[PDB]
Structure formats: C-alpha cells, structure tokens
Amino acid sequence: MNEKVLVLIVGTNPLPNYVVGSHLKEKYDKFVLIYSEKNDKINQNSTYDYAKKLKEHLNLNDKCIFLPLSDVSNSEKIINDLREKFPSEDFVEVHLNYTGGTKTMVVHIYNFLKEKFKNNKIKFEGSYLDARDYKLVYDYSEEAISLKDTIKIDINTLLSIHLYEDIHFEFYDTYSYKQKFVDSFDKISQEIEKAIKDDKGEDFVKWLEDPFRKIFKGENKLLEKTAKFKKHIEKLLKDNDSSPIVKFNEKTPQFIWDILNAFPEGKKLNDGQKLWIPDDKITNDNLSSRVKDTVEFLNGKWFEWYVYSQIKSELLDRKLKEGEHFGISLKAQKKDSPYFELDIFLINGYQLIGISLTTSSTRELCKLKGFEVIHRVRQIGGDESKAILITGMDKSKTEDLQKDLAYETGSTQKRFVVFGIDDWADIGSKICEEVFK
Amino acid sequence: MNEKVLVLIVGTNPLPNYVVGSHLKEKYDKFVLIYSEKNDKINQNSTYDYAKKLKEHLNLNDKCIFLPLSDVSNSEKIINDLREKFPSEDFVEVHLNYTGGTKTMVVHIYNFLKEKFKNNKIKFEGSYLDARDYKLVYDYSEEAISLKDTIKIDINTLLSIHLYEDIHFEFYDTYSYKQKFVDSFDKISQEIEKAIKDDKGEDFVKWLEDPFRKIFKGENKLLEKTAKFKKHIEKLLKDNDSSPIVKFNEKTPQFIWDILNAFPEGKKLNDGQKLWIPDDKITNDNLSSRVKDTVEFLNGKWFEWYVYSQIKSELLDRKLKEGEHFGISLKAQKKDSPYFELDIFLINGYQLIGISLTTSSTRELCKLKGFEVIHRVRQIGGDESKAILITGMDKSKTEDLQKDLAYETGSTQKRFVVFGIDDWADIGSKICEEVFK
RNA sequence: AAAA
Ligand SMILES: [Mn+2]
Ligand SMILES: [Mn+2]
Numbered sequence: 001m002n003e004k005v006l007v008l009i010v011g012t013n014p015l016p017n018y019v020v021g022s023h024l025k026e027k028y029d030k031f032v033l034i035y036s037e038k039n040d041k042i043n044q045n046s047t048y049d050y051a052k053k054l055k056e057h058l059n060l061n062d063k064c065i066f067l068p069l070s071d072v073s074n075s076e077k078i079i080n081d082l083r084e085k086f087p088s089e090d091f092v093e094v095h096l097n098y099t100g101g102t103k104t105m106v107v108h109i110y111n112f113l114k115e116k117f118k119n120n121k122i123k124f125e126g127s128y129l130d131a132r133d134y135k136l137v138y139d140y141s142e143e144a145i146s147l148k149d150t151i152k153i154d155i156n157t158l159l160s161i162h163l164y165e166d167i168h169f170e171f172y173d174t175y176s177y178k179q180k181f182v183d184s185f186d187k188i189s190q191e192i193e194k195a196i197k198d199d200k201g202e203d204f205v206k207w208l209e210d211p212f213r214k215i216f217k218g219e220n221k222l223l224e225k226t227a228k229f230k231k232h233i234e235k236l237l238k239d240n241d242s243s244p245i246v247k248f249n250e251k252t253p254q255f256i257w258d259i260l261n262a263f264p265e266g267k268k269l270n271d272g273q274k275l276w277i278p279d280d281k282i283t284n285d286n287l288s289s290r291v292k293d294t295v296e297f298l299n300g301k302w303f304e305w306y307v308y309s310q311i312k313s314e315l316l317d318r319k320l321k322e323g324e325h326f327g328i329s330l331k332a333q334k335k336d337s338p339y340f341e342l343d344i345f346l347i348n349g350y351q352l353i354g355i356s357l358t359t360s361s362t363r364e365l366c367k368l369k370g371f372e373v374i375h376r377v378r379q380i381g382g383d384e385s386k387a388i389l390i391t392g393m394d395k396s397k398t399e400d401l402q403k404d405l406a407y408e409t410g411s412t413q414k415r416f417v418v419f420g421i422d423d424w425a426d427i428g429s430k431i432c433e434e435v436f437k
Numbered sequence: 438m439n440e441k442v443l444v445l446i447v448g449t450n451p452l453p454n455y456v457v458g459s460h461l462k463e464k465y466d467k468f469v470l471i472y473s474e475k476n477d478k479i480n481q482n483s484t485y486d487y488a489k490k491l492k493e494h495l496n497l498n499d500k501c502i503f504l505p506l507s508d509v510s511n512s513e514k515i516i517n518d519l520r521e522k523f524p525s526e527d528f529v530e531v532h533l534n535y536t537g538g539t540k541t542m543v544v545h546i547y548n549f550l551k552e553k554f555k556n557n558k559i560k561f562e563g564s565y566l567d568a569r570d571y572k573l574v575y576d577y578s579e580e581a582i583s584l585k586d587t588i589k590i591d592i593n594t595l596l597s598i599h600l601y602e603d604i605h606f607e608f609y610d611t612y613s614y615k616q617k618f619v620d621s622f623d624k625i626s627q628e629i630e631k632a633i634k635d636d637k638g639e640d641f642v643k644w645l646e647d648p649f650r651k652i653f654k655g656e657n658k659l660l661e662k663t664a665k666f667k668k669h670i671e672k673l674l675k676d677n678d679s680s681p682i683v684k685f686n687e688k689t690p691q692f693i694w695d696i697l698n699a700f701p702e703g704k705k706l707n708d709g710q711k712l713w714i715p716d717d718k719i720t721n722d723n724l725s726s727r728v729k730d731t732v733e734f735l736n737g738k739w740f741e742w743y744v745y746s747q748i749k750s751e752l753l754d755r756k757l758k759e760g761e762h763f764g765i766s767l768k769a770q771k772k773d774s775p776y777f778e779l780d781i782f783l784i785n786g787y788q789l790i791g792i793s794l795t796t797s798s799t800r801e802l803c804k805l806k807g808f809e810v811i812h813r814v815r816q817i818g819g820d821e822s823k824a825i826l827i828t829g830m831d832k833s834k835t836e837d838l839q840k841d842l843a844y845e846t847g848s849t850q851k852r853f854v855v856f857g858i859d860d861w862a863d864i865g866s867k868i869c870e871e872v873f874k
Numbered sequence: 875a876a877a878a
Contacts (some may be wrong), residue, residue, distance in 0.1 A: 011878040012845045019875090036878080040849045043569040047847070047878075072847075072878065073567040075576045102878045103535045103543040104565050104574070110544050128541045130510035131875040132480040137541070139512045163845075238675055242668075338841040371808035379844055384875060404775040407816055408449045408600075410484070410509075410539075410876045412477045448876035456877090473876080484876075509876070539876045568877040821877065847878045 004093040004123075005065075007032040009101035009109060014050040014161040015382040016099045016129045019151045019350050020136060021058045028095065031058075032065040032087065034109060036072045036101075044072060053161045069105065078108045086116070093123035131384045132411045134349070153350045154324040159332050159380055169327035169345070172312060176329075177301060180293040184264040189309065191262040192302050195255045201424045205359050205392050207256050208298065211244030215275065216295045223291040225284045233277055249274040259298075267294045303359050303424075304328060304343050307390060310428030311346070318436070320347075332380075340376055346435060352381025353435050359392045361421070363401075366391045370405050374416060384409070388434065390419040390427060441530040442467035446538030446546060447488040451598040452819040453536045453566045456588045456787050457573060458495045461564075465532065468497050469524060471504045471546060481509060490598045506542065515545045520553075528554065532562040568821045569848045571786070590787045591761045595818055596769050606782070607766040608759045609749060614738060617730045621701045626746070628696040629739050637692055638861045642796050642829050644693055645736065648681035652712065653732045660728045662721045670714050686711045696735075704731050737796045741765060741780050744794055744827060747865030748781070755873070757784070769817070779813055783872060789818025790872050792825040798858070800838065803828040807842045811853055820846070825871065827856040827864065850874075 006028040008017050021031070035051040036044065048068075055064045067085050071077040094117040098106040110126060118124035126139035134148035156167045170176065178185045195204060215236060222228045236245050260270045267290050270276055278287060308328045315326050330342040344355040354377035358369050370389040377385035391398060398420040405416050423430045443465040445454045458468070470491060475483035485505075492501045504522050508514040531554045535543040547563065554561050563576035571585035593604050607613060615622045632641060652673065659665040673680045697707050704727050707713060715724055745765045757763050762784040770776040781792040793810035797803055807826045814822035828835060835857035842853055860867045 009878085011875080012847045013875060013878080016875040036847075038849065042567075043848050043850050044878095045845070045847055045849045073565060073569070073572075073574050075574065076579060098540050098544060099875050100878070101540075102565075103538075103540065105878075106540050107535060107544055107547055107563070107576075111548070126512070126544070128510065128512075128539070129875055130479075132510060135510070137511055139545075142513050144511065235672075235675055239672065334840070336840075338837050340841070368805035368809060371812050372805060374812055375808045375842065375844070382875080400775045403771070403773075404777065405812060406771075406774070407812070408482065408876095410449050410473070410482055411480045412475070412482050413480050446876085450877060453877040536877050542876075566877055819877080845878095 001090055002092050003030055003089060004028040005030045005032060005087065005091050005095070007034060007094065007096045007109070007113065008054070009096075009098055009105055010035045010047045010051045010054065011100035011102075012047060012050070013100065013382045013384075014054055015153075015158065015350060015384070016131070017050075017054050017097070018057065018153065018157075018161055019147055020097045020099065020127065020129055021054065021060075022151050023136065023145070023147050024095070025058060025060070028093070030063050030065060030087070030089075031060045032067050034067040034069060034101070034105070036069050039070065042071060042073075049163055050161065053163070057157050057161055072102045073104045075104060075108055078105060079112050082109065082112050083116075086113075091117060091122055093125070094118075095123075095125045095127065097127045097129070099127070099129045132413075148349050151350055152325070153347060154321075155327065155330065155345055155347060156324075158347065158350075158352060162380060162382070164332045164334055164380065166331075166333050166339075168329070168331045169323060170329040171322055171327065172308075175305060177293070177297050177305065181264060181267065181297070184262070184267075188259070188262045188297070189302070189305060191259045193306060193309070195259065196306060197425045198255075199422075199425055200255055201392065201421050203253060204256065204259075205361070205421070207252065208359065211248045212295075212298060214244035215248060216269070216291065217299070223295055224288045226278055226280075226282055226287050227284075229278065229287060229291075230280075233275075245275050245277075263294050266290060269294055300357075300359050303357050303390075306424070307355065307357055307427055307431075308344055311344075311431050313428060314432040315346075340380075342373070342376055342380070346431075347381075348435050352377055352385040353388060353431075354380065354385065355388045355390060355431070357390050361392045361394070361397070363393070363397060366393055366397070366418075367401055367404065370401055370416065370418060374405065374407075384411075384415075386415045386417070386435070388417040388419065388431065390423070392421040392424075393418070395420050395422060439529040440467050440526055441465045442469060442524070442528045442532065444469045444471065444531065444533040444546070444550065445488075445491070446533075446535055446542055447472040447484045447491070448537035448539070449484060449487070450537060450819045450821075451484075451487040451491060452590075452595070452787065452821070453568070454491055454534065455494065455590065455594075455598055456584055457534045457536065457564060457566050458491060459588050460573065460582075460584055461532070461534075462495060462497075465530075466500060467524070467526070467528070468492075468495075468501045469504055470501060471506060471519075471538065471542070473509045474505045474507050476507065479508065479510070486600060487598065490600070494594050494598060509539045509542055512541055512545050515542060516549050519546060519549045523549070523553070528559055530560045530562065532564065534564045534566070536564070536566045569850075571788075585786050588787050589762070590784060592764065592767070592782060592784060595784065595787075595789060599817060599819065601769040601771055601817065603776070604767070604769040606760060606764040606768075608764050609745075612742065613766070614730065614734045614742070618701055618704065618734070621699060624699040625696060625734075626739075626742060628692070628699045630743060630746070632692045632696065633743060634862050635692070636862060637690075638829065638858050639798075640690060641693065642798060642858075644689065645796065648684040649735065651681040652685060653706065653728060654736065660732055661725055663715050663719050663724045664721075666724065667715055670712075682712055682714075700731055703727060706731055706735075737794070740796045740827075741794050743861075744792065744864055744868075745781055748783070748868050751865055751869040752783075777813055777817070779810070779817070785872050789814055789822035790825060791817070791822065792827060792868070794827050796829045798829045798831075798834075800830065800834055803830055803834075803838055803855075804841065807838060807853065807855065811842065811844075821852075823852045823854070823872075825854040825856065825868070827860070829858045830855075832857055832859060 038046040325347040346353040356373035373387040470488040472488040783790040791814040810824040835855040
C-alpha cells in the first residue's frame with residue numbers, strides 16, 4: 001500500500017495543472033484528474049481533451065484516474081459523482097490542487113476530500129498555483145514553493161496541451177532567407193543591424209514607404225512579370241516631380257545604398273547607384289530571380305530576423321534551448337481548423353511570451369496586430385501568457401496602444417507590452433528586461 | 438437586530454457580483470465586499486476600484502463593509518486578514534457568493550465563515566452564478582434560480598463597473614449622417630436597403646473596392662486638398678482604358694447610380710453619368726463639403742446604419758430600450774486612456790453582445806477585426822460577453838474565421854459569431870436568433 | 875491559474 005494520490009481539477013487552462021503535476025509527479029503514486037462532461041442543456045462543455053493531454057504529456061499512464069463530473073456548478077451532482085467515482089483504495093496522503101475548475105468544483109471537492117481522507121487521519125493537503133508570483137502554496141503545511149525557474153515547458157508541449165498540432169518553427173540555422181540569399185545573408189543582416197543600431201530605423205522605414213514600396217509594390221506578381229513592372233516603372237516616370245524613381249536614384253541615403261549593395265549582385269535592386277530597370281531582354285523568370293526575394297526581405301522580414309538575432313544573445317547565456325523555448329516563424333493549427341503564425345515565440349519557464357513584429361507607424365494597423373498577439377498567446381499559452389508588440393510607432397503612440405488594449409487580470413505586471421521604433425536598437429535588451437523581470 | 442449579511446468576493450470580472458447583488462439586495466441589510474490590496478512585489482493589483490463601483494451602483498452606502506485581503510494567493514494570510522478584519526457583529530444569516538475571486542479565496546473564506554458562524558443562531562448559505570446556464574445555484578440546496586431574464590443592466594452601468602467613462606452613443610434619432618445628408622438620408626438609406634435586400638451586397642462591395650476606393654481613397658488626405666485629387670484623377674487617367682475613372686463612368690451598375698444620385702445635389706460624387714472631376718478654382722474646403730462626408734458614409738458607414746435599422750425593429754418588439762440596452766457608435770475611455778469604438782452594442786439581460794461591422798471580403802482584415810471585437814467586449818462587458826463580426830466574406834470564410842479565433846471558455850454556446858455576406862439581407866432575424874437563443 |  002502506502003499509495004499517495006494527487007487530485008487535479010482540470011479546467012479550460014491546462015498549463016497550471018501541467019506545472020504542478022511536473023513538480024509533484026515523483027512524490028505521488030496515483031493521479032485523479034477531475035474533468036467535466038458535455039451537456040448542451042446546461043451549456044457546459046467538457047474539459048476531457050485537456051485531461052487526456054495532461055495524462056499524455058505528464059506521462060501518468062495507467063497510474064492516472066479520470067473522474068468525470070456531470071454538472072460543474074451543481075453542488076449535489078458534484079459530490080454525488082465524487083463519492084461514486086473517487087477511488088475506493090486506501091491512501092496515506094491525499095493531495096488536492098484546486099487551482100483549476102469552477103469555484104463550485106473547487107469548494108465541493110476540497111471539503112469532500114477533507115471529510116473523506118482527512119476524516120481518516122490520512123495526510124491531506126491543498127495547493128494553488130499563484131499566476132502572479134509563480135508559487136505553489138500549501139494550505140496546511142504553509143509552504144510556498146516557487147516553480148518559476150524549476151518547471152520548464154517547450155513549444156510543442158505547450159501547444160499540444162492547448163489542443164494545437166502540427167507545430168512548425170525555424171531556427172538560427174534554418175531561416176528561410178538564409179537560403180534565398182545564400183552566401184550573402186550574413187552580410188545583408190550585418191549591414192542592416194548596423195543601421196538599426198545607429199538609430200536609423202525611422203529613416204529606413206520612411207525610405208521603405210517611398211520609394212521602395214512605391215516602385216516594388218503594386219499589382220500582384222508585379223515583380224514576377226516584367227510587363228507589369230515595365231508599365232509600372234514608366235507610369236512612375238510620368239509623375240515627373242513626384243516620381244519615386246527620381247528619389248530612389250538621387251535622394252536615397254547612403255546607409256540604404258550600403259544595405260542594397262550588400263545583397264548579391266544577382267539579387268540587387270540597384271544598378272550601381274540607380275534603379276535597375278529591366279530591358280525587353282529580361283524575362284519574367286529573370287525578374288523574380290533578382291527582385292522578388294530581395295523585395296520580400298526588405299518589406300518587413302528583416303525586422304523579424306533582427307529582433308530574433310538581437311535576443312538570441314541573452315537567451316543562450318540564460319541556457320534556454322532553441323526550438324524548445326525560443327524560435328521564429330511559429331505555425332500550428334487546431335484539428336480541421338485554420339493555421340496561425342507568430343513571428344517570435346519565447347518561453348520563460350512556463351510563461352509564453354509571444355512577440356508580433358511590424359515596421360508600421362500606423363495606429364490602426366498596429367492596434368489590430370496587438371489585438372491579434374493577445375488572442376493567440378491566450379489560445380496558445382493560456383490566460384496568463386504575455387504578448388509584446390514591437391512597432392515602428394513613436395513612444396507616445398506605443399504607450400497609448402498599451403493603455404488602450406490593457407485588460408485587468410489581477411497582476412501588476414503588464415502582459416501587453418508595445419515597443420516603439422526607438423526601442424529597435426536595444427530591443428534585445430528591452431525584451432530581456434521585460435521578459436525576465 | 439437580525440442582521441443578515443451577504444459576502445461578495447470581488448475579482449477582476451465585476452459583472453457577476455452586480456448581478457447577484459441586484460437580486461439579493463432586498464433580503465439582506467449588510468454587505469461585505471472582500472477586495473484585494475495592491476502589492477507590486479507579489480505582482481498583485483487591487484480590485485478595490487471594482488468593489489467601489491459595485492457599492493455605488495448597488496447603492497449600499499453604509500450597509501457596505503470593505504475587507505482588504507493583503508495576499509489573494511496565500512491561504513494563511515487570507516484567513517489571518519479575515520479574522521482580523523471580518524465584521525464581528527451579530528448576524529443571523531451569512532450568505533456568501535463565491536462566484537468571484539481567486540480559488541484560494543473562494544475556499545478559505547468559505548470555510549472561515551462556515552466555522553465562525555457554525556452556531557445555529559447563525560444560518561450559513563452559499564451561492565454561485567453559473568455563467569453557462571445563467572442561474573444562481575445554492576450550495577446544498579437543489580434550488581435553481583435563473584437570473585438570465587430577471588436581472589437587466591444598462592450600457593452606462595456595465596461600462597462603469599468595468600472602469601470606463603465618457604460613455605457616448607448615437608441612437609436612431611441622432612445619427613450623425615442623418616444630420617449631414619439633410620433631406621436625403623432616408624432616400625440614401627432606402628436605396629441601400631432596397632439593393633441589399635436584392636442580393637446586391639457583393640455587387641456594391643466590389644464596386645466599393647474598384648473603382649470607388651481607387652478614386653476617392655487613394656491618398657491620406659486627397660479629399661481635403663483639391664490638388665492631390667486632380668493629381669490622383671490624372672494619375673489614374675494615365676492608364677486610359679482600364680483606369681478606375683473609366684469603370685466609374687461606364688461599367689457602373691444602375692443601383693449604384695440610384696444611390697449616388699440619392700445624395701444631396703451639392704454632395705454627390707458624380708456629375709451626371711460621369712465622375713465630377715474637380716476643376717481649378719475649387720477650394721479645398723468646397724471639395725471637402727462635397728466628397729468628404731459622402732465618401733465616408735459610402736465606404737461602409739452605410740452598413741452600420743443598415744444593420745442598426747434591421748435590428749432596431751426586432752428589439753423594440755422585445756423590451757430592449759434604445760440607448761439603455763442597444764445602440765450604434767459607442768465610444769468610451771478609461772481615465773487617461775484612449776477611447777474605443779464599437780460599431781453596434783446590445784445587452785440581452787446582463788450579457789453584452791458587441792457587433793463589429795465590416796464590408797470586406799478579405800480574410801486578413803476581417804480576422805483582425807475579430808480580435809478587436811473579442812478584446813473590446815471583454816474589457817467593456819466582462820469575460821462572458823459575446824462578440825459578433827458581420828463580414829462580407831462567404832460562408833466558407835466565415836466558418837473558417839469562426840474556428841480560427843474561437844477560444845475555449847467552457848460553454849457549448851459560441852461567443853464569437855461571424856456572419857457573412859449572404860446573411861446581410863436577413864441580418865435582422867439572424868441577429869435576433871443568435872442573441873436571444 | 876481573480877463568473878472553469
Ligand atoms: Mn508580423
Ligand atoms: Mn467597422
């Protein structure tokens with residue numbers, strides 16, 4: 001005998017159970033996962049899919065007992081099913097983690113176990129995981145254990161316990177544009193990093209709006225069909241005074257030219273110090289081989305590799321593993337449901353920090369992109385996950401956004417942090433400070 | 438003499454305590470609002486402002502006692518602060534609503550009061566408001582009191598208990614564009630309503646994309662400067678055929694011309710069957726008085742008035758009161774925080790149904806508008822608010838968006854509803870269905 | 875994990 005059992009209340013947030021289970025798996029022998037059933041008459045769904053995922057990812061196997069509850073808000077039907085379905089075996093210690101579930105479930109499961117085992121002088125203990133100071137507090141023993149730097153979770157386990165699948169991500173050694181600009185990516189990335197670190201981001205993004213996007217963006221497949229481009233180029237020449245081609249050749253700053261001249265000669269958007277305008281001998285395949293990949297990277301993809309490279313320094317010194325706790329280009333889906341894409345993911349302990357990146361200074365576009373990162377990390381990491389939005393907006397607008405999209409969760413620490421264009425140079429440090437503090 | 442007390446555990450969601458308080462305020466002469474203090478060192482904010490608002494709108498005044506809990510995660514510190522600060526007065530019935538607060542609070546308060554009032558001179562009772570079935574279940578009593586159709590909240594009170602101020606909404610008799618298009622708004626709306634009922638939505642939207650949003654919405658202030666515009670007109674005219682100007686003058690369906698000519702004479706975008714092309718000596722203020730308000734209302738505001746008029750009738754049949762339970766163009770702010778804008782608001786009992794309207798068929802733009810309406814109704818009405826996003830997408834895209842952004846709250850009823858283009862003509866009954874099921 |  002001498003069996004020790006752990007009773008977990010399984011709600012719609014599975015992460016708090018996973019953390020407590022990992023910390024107490026060894027010191028207990030059997031596990032009771034109290035979940036819920038589906039009853040559309042009472043508008044109640046089931047937390048069983050989370051209970052299956054908690055059994056699998058904690059690897060409790062057959063040492064796990066599933067206790068179903070028919071009504072999560074009916075005191076009578078809770079205690080009824082409890083006596084009829086709680087294990088009849090003897091135990092030396094009965095530990096309850098009432099962190100999840102309803103309040104009804106919590107109240108009636110706590111008092112029932114208190115009067116079924118603690119009534120038999122069998123060790124009884126309650127526990128609740130603080131989502132604010134990251135501690136597991138014991139009711140009777142009065143112990144407060146911080147599981148912040150002890151319990152660790154990865155991106156695959158975190159999304160699977162939240163019922164997401166097909167988890168794809170990229171690494172420092174598997175970035176897509178490392179292949180598109182092979183034997184030249186480091187040079188292009190180094191040059192851009194210099195300018196952004198030199199507080200030239202506002203100037204770069206301005207140049208990206210005019211003329212970069214005035215010339216290289218328009219009709220779909222503008223840069224994959226020469227005819228569309230050549231017609232587009234001639235139309236811009238007709239604008240004369242307001243022509244972006246004139247501004248590209250003449251008013252383009254030098255740090256831009258250095259970035260452009262960093263691209264491989266076969267994939268340069270410039271003809272020395274002027275805009276490369278293809279002739280009638282240049283085919284549609286030649287254009288995409290030179291313009292498409294370079295334009296896509298300068299349209300916002302550089303800002304993603306920048307932030308990921310800026311933060312990679314502090315992370316490797318914090319002994320965090322790549323592909324497990326940090327990565328880029330995160331994609332996943334629910335079964336028979338559309339996919340999602342998060343620019344940068346980062347997991348400090350078990351707190352998921354989702355980072356969405358945009359080079360925009362427009363209020364509406366940044367606000368919606370913040371809206372998105374809040375909801376994704378909610379569906380992906382839980383209701384206690386952080387969302388940081390890095391934008392090209394100024395400090396004032398950035399601050400307003402944080403205030404506008406702020407939701408009271410009971411924690412002084414903010415879960416929605418917006419970073420402005422000024423923070424770009426030291427974004428790596430600014431994030432490290434935010435995430436680890 | 439016989440002081441019956443009701444104890445409410447105050448959390449971040451204040452709506453449940455207001456609902457229960459409004460129902461049981463008459464049968465109790467004392468009220469204890471257990472609220473949290475602010476200790477930044479333990480990452481814990483104060484729900485005092487939420488409990489303050491409840492005392493005001495429930496008009497408890499002197500019958501209200503405030504009990505500050507220093508730590509809302511430590512069992513020991515909870516009970517210690519309780520014994521130290523709970524009213525030591527004589528009570529004949531002690532009723533606890535444990536629907537809110539942290540799990541630890543709901544269990545340790547429950548059992549602290551249950552023992553402090555075990556003497557049969559004092560009768561103990563416990564309540565919980567089930568958000569799923571909208572009922573007030575009583576502990577140990579099979580009694581089931583539904584409050585779905587009994588308790589009703591006004592839009593000003595709901596935003597006030599969630600800490601928002603400067604609540605401004607427009608109703609039927611005070612629509613802004615009804616004052617801007619004088620003696621024509623009824624004819625403009627009639628033509629738009631008539632066309633939508635004739636399955637001409639997609640038609641309008643496609644014309645709104647091209648050539649409408651290519652002639653009047655190409656530059657950030659082209660309808661505020663006559664030069665930019667005539668420049669924009671000539672820049673489109675450079676294309677000759679396939680220019681947005683030609684499609685307007687030629688390939689423009691008749692029901693569009695009917696709406697365009699329904700506008701007041703001095704505020705029409707057309708000059709016969711052609712696009713009035715502003716000539717020289719047209720002031721940037723004379724241009725504004727003609728195209729500015731017409732372009733804005735024709736860019737989508739029309740969809741907001743359409744949906745509002747279709748729902749207005751259904752609701753009046755019911756008891757919903759305009760301005761008190763439904764309305765259009767709601768704006769409000771938290772103190773020293775930016776304002777928000779929800780297109781249409783509705784309150785079915787005490788449930789906030791927020792409706793965001795967009796005439797777009799693009800999945801990205803609609804997706805983003807979905808994250809917005811979800812986050813807004815949770816800040817404005819609480820975590821049990823429904824969001825509805827009436828898009829211009831087809832049934833396939835709507836069901837995909839509905840699955841992409843859906844979060845698991847624990848209810849078998851949807852809380853994010855994505856109506857599509859085909860639902861437009863019967864949006865009145867469609868909304869009546871989803872809101873009052 | 876402060877109306878699951
Ligand atoms: Mn992005
Ligand atoms: Mn809208």
